[PDB]
Amino acid sequence: VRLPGLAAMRQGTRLFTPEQGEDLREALRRRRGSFQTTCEVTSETTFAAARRLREKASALAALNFASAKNPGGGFAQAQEEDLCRGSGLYFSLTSPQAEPYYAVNRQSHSALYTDHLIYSPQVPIFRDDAGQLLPAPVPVNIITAPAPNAGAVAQSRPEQLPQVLPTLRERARRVLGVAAWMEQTHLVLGAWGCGVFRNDPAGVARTFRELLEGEAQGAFEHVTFAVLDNHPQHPTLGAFRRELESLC
Ligand SMILES: Nc1ncnc2c1ncn2[C@@H]1O[C@H](COP(=O)(O)OP(=O)(O)OC[C@H]2O[C@H](O)[C@H](O)[C@@H]2O)[C@@H](O)[C@H]1O
């Protein structure tokens, strides 16, 4: 039997095309300065921070560290795979209205990818990190967007190297712009493409904080950076702790 909430979420899945970029900027403009934004940095999984926040959250959204080319990246240790094995996210990402995001990214033939985003609303979370069922499913909105593949740019098209950071900065701006357009109050962010995509975890942490300090200042109630780091040296998490300290 089909799981509860899957059909409503798949039916409501929506694509933001790159020609909507100024619609998303204006939504950020219009929402600037609405609250006192509290921003933590934690050790939890994206979905752990989600299930924590949901009882305080009018409008909960979390960022999927997405593959540009096939839904779920084709599945092993990555965040998007965490989200799919424990939620109905995959049923949304394979929806018909989302096909253009995967189709155009493939035709792009560029490691920086395009500026399409997938908004999946009310995605049921069914399991915790240990993998056990949940009493009741807890729903979360998911913005899906690929960070530029810094690793593939360096190994395949170094000419685009100077474009990695601008690309990541404008794309992060559209992610917050989607969240503002959908009037979301609580954002679960993280180490967007600092694992398999090889981006510099210091760079994405400061790019986030720059926008949270400028264009997106006050735009959301509560931002949670849920950076999972199992490596003993803890360099990813330590980069977001270090870089987000002034803003909290
Ligand atoms: N379950 C998790 N929950 C929260 N944070 C996590 C989790 N797993 C890892 N992190 C942290 O988030 C950081 C980045 O996790 P990554 O998934 O590599 O995102 P990307 O930007 O590199 O590219 C994702 C690609 O890899 C996949 O194949 C996708 O399909 C894409 O093709 C990790 O280093 C962790 O510190």
Contact between 156 and 37 under an 8 Å Cβ cutoff? The reply is: no
CA 196 to each of CA 27, 149, 158, 193: distance values in angstroms, whole numbers, following the listed order: 31, 8, 18, 7
Smallest CA-to-CA distance from 106 within 69, 72, 80, 71 is with 69
Using DSSP's 3-state secondary structure scheme, residue 95 falls into: coil
Residues with CB under 6 A from ligand 1: 45-46, 65, 67, 73, 78-80, 82, 147, 190-197, 226-229, 236
**Candidates 65, 87, 105: which one to mutate for ligand 1, based on the most atoms within 8 Å of Cβ?**
65
Cα distances (Å, whole numbers) of residue 58 to 54, 55, 80, 181, 201: 8, 8, 24, 15, 30
Q: What span, in angstroms and rounded, lies between the C-alpha atoms of 99 and 227?
A: 29
> Residue 110 Cα, ligand 1 centroid: separation in angstroms?
20
Helix 21-31 × helix 164-181 angle, to 10°: 60
Assigned token pair, 57:
């959250």
Q: How far apart, in Å, do the first and last CA atoms of the chain sit?
A: 45
Give 117's strand partners.
16
Q: Domains for the chain: give ranges and CATH numbers.
A: 1-248 (3.40.220.10)
- Exposure letters 73-92 (e unless 16+ CB within 10 A, then b): beeeebbbbbbbebbbbbbb
Token output for 245: 């300290």
The CA distance from 50 to 73, in Å, is 22
Whether 90 and 84 have beta carbons less than 8 Å apart is answered as yes
Which resolution in angstroms does this entry have? 2.8
- Nearest ligand 1 atom to alpha carbon 227: 5
